[PDB]
Design a binder for this molecule. Structure first.
Ligand SMILES: *[C@@H]1C=C2C=C(O)C(=O)C=C2N1
Ligand SMILES: [K+]
Length: 236
């Protein structure tokens, strides 16, 4: 029941792997680089806001989420955007070829993303390599994604409703794993999957550091949506 909804949410919020536009894909480094930085910082901001709208649409397809106070929805979405963005990008990209595929089908090489993202893009590619080396199926990935957002957050109006949705999702992922791979559970696999979440939070704080650096540089000032994201995500 829940995993079907979660997988449909994922599928509906991801680009079909046949519409990948390799038009702005450039793999020659000598050409990969010489574009003034301004354009890359803007490209960075656009990728972030474009995936903000995509992922919010995904979040709205999570059974039970929409029944939560609108303020809780905004707190969960803003608190997890960076983690969602990093997880979804790392799951659909191709780390071995150094190819990044964003929430919209654009395929860029790592060396092109380094100009805008900073070293964080390398931390992202390493995360993609680690995540894919454990070959999570789509049902499991849709559950981890749901659990990355539907989790405890300070300043929540109704924390018990969220806690209930989280338990529902955790239990759904455990049932899928146990049924799929024999009546005998895989507690160790399960713990590695849930352990992928803290790594995601850190990748995120590393995204806040990249945004903070760009705000200080003041060359390509962060647009209103990124300014708000930065201030709203600040944990203190
Ligand atoms: C991305 C930004 C975060 C904000 C929080 O409140 C967390 O708990 C984790 C985060 N990583
Ligand atoms: K496809």
């Amino acid at each position: 029941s829940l995993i079907s909804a979660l997988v449909r949410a994922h599928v509906d919020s991801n680009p079909a792997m046949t519409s990948l536009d390799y038009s702005r894909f450039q793999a020659n480094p000598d050409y990969q680089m010489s574009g003034d930085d301004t354009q890359h910082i803007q490209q960075f901001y656009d990728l972030l806001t474009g995936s903000m709208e995509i992922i919010r649409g995904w979040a709205e397809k999570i059974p039970g989420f929409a029944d939560l106070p609108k303020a809780d929805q905004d707190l969960l979405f803003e608190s997890a955007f960076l983690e969602l963005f990093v997880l979804r990008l790392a799951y659909r990209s191709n780390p071995v070829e150094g190819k990044l595929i964003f929430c919209n089908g654009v395929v860029l090489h790592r060396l092109q993303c380094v100009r805008g993202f900073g070293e964080w893009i390398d931390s992202i590619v390493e995360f993609s390599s680690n995540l894919q080396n454990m070959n999570i199926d789509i049902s499991a990935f849709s559950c981890i994604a749901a659990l990355a957002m539907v989790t405890e957050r300070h300043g929540l109006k109704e924390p018990k409703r969220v806690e209930e949705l989280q338990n529902k999702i955790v239990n759904c992922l455990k049932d899928h794993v146990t049924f799929n791979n024999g009546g005998l559970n895989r507690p160790n696999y399960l713990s590695k999957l849930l352990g992928k979440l803290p790594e995601l939070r850190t990748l995120c704080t590393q995204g806040l550091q990249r945004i903070f650096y760009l705000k200080l540089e003041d060359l390509v000032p962060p647009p209103a949506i990124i300014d708000k994201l930065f201030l709203d995500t600040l944990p203190f």
